[PDB]
Amino acid sequence: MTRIILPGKTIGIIGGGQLGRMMALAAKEMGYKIAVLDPTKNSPCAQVADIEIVASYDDLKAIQHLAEISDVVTYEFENIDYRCLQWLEKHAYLPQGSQLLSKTQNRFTEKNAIEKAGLPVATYRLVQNQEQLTEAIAELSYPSVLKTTTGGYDGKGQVVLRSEADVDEARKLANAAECILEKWVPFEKEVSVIVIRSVSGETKVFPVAENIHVNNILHESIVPARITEELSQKAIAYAKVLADELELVGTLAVEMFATADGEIYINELAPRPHNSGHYTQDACETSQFGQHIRAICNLPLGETNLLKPVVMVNILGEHIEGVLRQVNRLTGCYLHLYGKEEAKAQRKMGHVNILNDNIEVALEKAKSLHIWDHQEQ
Amino acid sequence: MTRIILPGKTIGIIGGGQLGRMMALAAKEMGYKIAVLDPTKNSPCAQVADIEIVASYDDLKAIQHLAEISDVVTYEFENIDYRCLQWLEKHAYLPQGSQLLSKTQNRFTEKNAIEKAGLPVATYRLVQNQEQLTEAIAELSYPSVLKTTTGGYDGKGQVVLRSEADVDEARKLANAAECILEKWVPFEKEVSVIVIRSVSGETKVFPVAENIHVNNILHESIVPARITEELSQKAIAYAKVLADELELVGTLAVEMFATADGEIYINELAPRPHNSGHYTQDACETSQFGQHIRAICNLPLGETNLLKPVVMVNILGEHIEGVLRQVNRLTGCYLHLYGKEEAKAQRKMGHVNILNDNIEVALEKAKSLHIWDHQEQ
Ligand SMILES: Nc1ncnc2c1ncn2[C@@H]1O[C@H](COP(=O)(O)OP(=O)(O)O)[C@@H](O)[C@H]1O
Ligand SMILES: Nc1ncnc2c1ncn2[C@@H]1O[C@H](COP(=O)(O)OP(=O)(O)O)[C@@H](O)[C@H]1O
């Protein structure tokens, strides 16, 4: 499309957490004005916004007020209900649309969409009752994973089935929610690729990141991912096909499992800037945030070249005190802090990008700081 | 010396122009709060700040207020009364001090300080009346340049004396303001170096940039500067010498003349982030703005490696319509706009950083856009 949102206009963001703040910082460099809607006052994004609307995400009047004063609307918060999404899509300017968001909100719908796009996923079965769970266990065997189809984004919303001894905890889960059961994928590495597609269809792909999770929370992203050139090219190709097939506008994070045998399976999609892309802020020619703004405003996309190898490390509530006390040791480290007040143990408070010519040296730097000893074990 | 301003604290900025705005954006990424004092409501920096104080720079009570709500204060406005800074360094925390600003604000005192350091400047004479102008011309001969000693570029401020035919114009200037006359330096290139020195003494220098001025306004900065390795090394050494001898805390921009025979003359010093350092936002590991914040807060400085060659081009009031009209054509270009509402022909509205593996391809890109046809002549 030809529709361009010029510098000087207002970008409205639904959700005022760190992803909102970082989008807003990127937009401000390019001379955009920012409006944000969020349930809590003084959110991370509001701390950088020109206009703040403090309301619930299901409050259609407030959503309308945001739209009314915005030249383009984007979201960080994903669980926007259909009546609000349709209103925005048809009566405001929401170039991302609602179709992609709706697909990624349900694990079953999501896997179907991926397979229909021609891409591999772990073999899976929908589980809506006990009978279906029984049949699924029979078909897929052990080991397996039962996950709820909606409302993550946790460790509680799933149960790993290694033996018949785990079935009872699984039945409990299938009793409270609609689920999916997936075959256990024996993977070597978890990897992700951020792809960007503008309103006019220009596409850019970021380099493959290797992701290390701990307690179902991201710990580290390592770029370049420590994988063969063949796995890398495959992950990138898969992401590009997804972006095309799903008619992406904006940002898509594609999380994947990579096997020793060089197989890729697609795990999940997030139609927004993602935690596994924060490395781009310091190590790439354009950040995922600068890219997202350009994409929705239909400006030319920037380059995604990796300019230096990087390890991103997450800063949770349990780490913030360690970071501040060790601040004098943060040479070659690039600190981002989100401006959150309460430091809950598993709340994401910031991240640090450790840049180095050698990836193993960056990894060692994080260890030597003794901030993440818990995650390291 | 050991004193550290931790992320989460409030940084106060005197002056709300583009330099304070970019300081503020970089500080926000680290989780700092920002206060700004500016005489005009909704200044570039206010659009990014948590707290805005609209008041004159000589309003001592507003200055005290800024001091009260801030954990550290810095300045962006280069023509601040040094008596205000004398108050701040004694009744608040101004790690930059008042000395450096007082020395660099007046061209004559500036020259004296550069010579005290042992570095070369163009031969110069103080001019307070017509008799002193006459004696200066007699002693220095032609060609020469007469410049006002204090901030008097809004614009004009200088007369180039190629022959006796220019003397009439110089007399006019000599009556209006205190001046110095300097010998014209026959240089092949103008270059600049940005040096950063933290509270605890840590010193970093950015790559040497080659600057192209049109009508005494910066037009392009070229990095790496197209000079010999030996000239780059000398420029870098001179910069460190100045930081050392001027007891620098914060940022110092050093503008220089490089002659055909490998000598460097120091033109002028600016005790702040400088227009010739804006390339660092997209081409270096740390920007001059992030480095300035880390310097005054006494955090470890970031690395200053050039990650990709770059041409920065200024966007003046005369250029902004052309930029907005040609946004479609800005591939490989990284646009920064300062949020100023009124365009005036020569007012600095933004800059664009053009990244390319080949510096000559970047330069051709700027020409092919035809936005700056007036400068290219
Ligand atoms: N089919 C599978 N095979 C092996 N490991 C899996 C499988 N599904 C999930 N996991 C593991 O569980 C973690 C969480 O799974 P995921 O579906 O990403 O849940 P969430 O949405 O909570 O992040 C993943 O990081 C992965 O290590
Ligand atoms: N002594 C000199 N010899 C040759 N060119 C000069 C000399 N002084 C200034 N110039 C030219 O004029 C420009 C403006 O002079 P400068 O002292 O930098 O004024 P300003 O403080 O307004 O930048 C310089 O960037 C340089 O190109």
What this model shows, in words?
- The structure is a homodimer of 377-residue chains.
- Chain A has 377 residues and is an alpha+beta fold.
- Chain A folds into three domains: 1-115, Rossmann fold, CATH 3.40.50.20; 116-184, ATP-grasp fold, A domain (Dna Ligase, domain 1), CATH 3.30.1490.20; 185-374, ATP-grasp fold, B domain (D-amino Acid Aminotransferase, Chain A, domain 1).
- Chain A has 13 helices and 17 strands.
- Chain A has helices at residues 18-29, 60-68, 82-91, 99-104, 107-116, 130-140, 167-176, 229-245, 280-283, 288-297, 317-325, 359-368, 373-376; strands spanning 10-14, 33-38, 51-54, 72-75, 124-127, 144-148, 158-161, 179-183, 189-197, 203-205, 209-214, 217-223, 250-258, 264-270, 310-316, 333-337, 348-355.
- In chain A, the strands form three sheets. In chain A, strands 9, 10, 11, 12, 13, 14, 15, 16 and 17 form a nine-stranded antiparallel β-sheet that branches. Chain A has a four-stranded parallel β-sheet with strand order 3-2-1-4, sandwiched between helices. Chain A has a four-stranded antiparallel β-sheet with strand order 5-8-6-7, with helices on both faces.
- The longest helix of chain A is centred in the middle third of the chain and has 17 residues, at 229-245.
- The N and C termini of chain A lie far apart (51 Å).
- The A-B interface holds A 4, 6-8, 25, 28-31, 33, 47-48, 50, 281-282, 285-286, 299-303, 305, 307-308, 324, 327-339, 350, 355 and B 4, 6-8, 25, 28-31, 33, 47-48, 50, 281-282, 285-286, 299-300, 302-303, 305, 307-308, 324, 327-339, 350, 355.
- One adenosine-5'-diphosphate binds at residues 122, 145, 147, 152-154, 182-185, 190, 213, 216, 267-268 of chain A.
- The PDB classes it as lyase.
- The entry lists the keywords carboxylase, ATP binding, lyase, ADP binding.
- The assembly is dimeric.
